[PDB]
DNA sequence: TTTTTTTTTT
């Protein structure tokens, strides 16, 4: 929701087509995310403290999610 | 494409020759770039607003590749 | 050596010269430069068009080089 | 010091307290200037060709290393 | 504080008011004059030897600075 | 006054 780069915030979302955006990448999820897996994303880049665009945190959470869940 | 350095845009492609471009920059790509793999590029630096000359941005895609590929 | 401020153009070569330089420059290079890497600089400068001299040009071919290689320590 | 403007040349050195002139022009260095660090920027420089005054030199010296450690 | 015109002398500031001058001269600083810039300032144009009058010299800190704190 | 190339949780 902010516009330009941000830091990583507690009630950050993805969009509602995330699953949809994440495919347009190559990132083919058959899940959708969860609520823990959200709130462990955010967790992790809150305390980090870097700034990304809105499209380039969705794109780190969809490589995330690929990553944890192929584990 | 635009003369002189322009931002990322959606529609943007490299040459038809970027096979052979990337492997004089010491890039070997054995398969071709894929919808999904230039989309993802162009979603990231698009938001991101840098610009740079076409063939930079070509040397870009091509570093790009190397590392998404080699994981 | 090629004398005074150019632009970047496609059969520049940094010379012999070129590794004991960028050693009195802090830059330990252990292997010569491959004719890719030296393509790819040559290609990047050569779009962006900015005038140095040749020891200027041979200073950021070094620093190009050392990060290139520090994933490593050596060539892609 | 050298006089007057100059250009950069191979033998130049900064001042021994250029650590702490550095600092007053606000860089902090944590470590002296080394003999490689001095030998690229004057090797710069002096293909540049242009001149200044000793002062103006340091100054850049000190914006140098700033960039170059960071 | 000399009339006419002077060259840079070490003891030399600026108005209290400069931030409101640069932005009045198109300079728009974010932050307040350090007292590191002015001594790089001063030390530069006290070596250089150029007169100018003080509203010339405040305009020079001004320049200065948008192009120092631009990098 | 104007030196500084280089996209990343696992």
Request: hydrophobic content about 50%; glycine content about 6%; charged content about 20%.
């Amino acid at each position: 929701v902010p516009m330009g780069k941000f830091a990583m915030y507690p009630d950050w979302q993805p969009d509602a087509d995330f699953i949809r955006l994440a495919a347009l990448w190559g990132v083919a999820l058959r899940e959708p995310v969860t609520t823990e897996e959200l709130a462990s994303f955010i967790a992790y880049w809150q305390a980090e403290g870097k700034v990304f665009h809105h499209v380039q945190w969705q794109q780190k959470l969809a490589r995330s999610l690929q990553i944890g869940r192929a584990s």
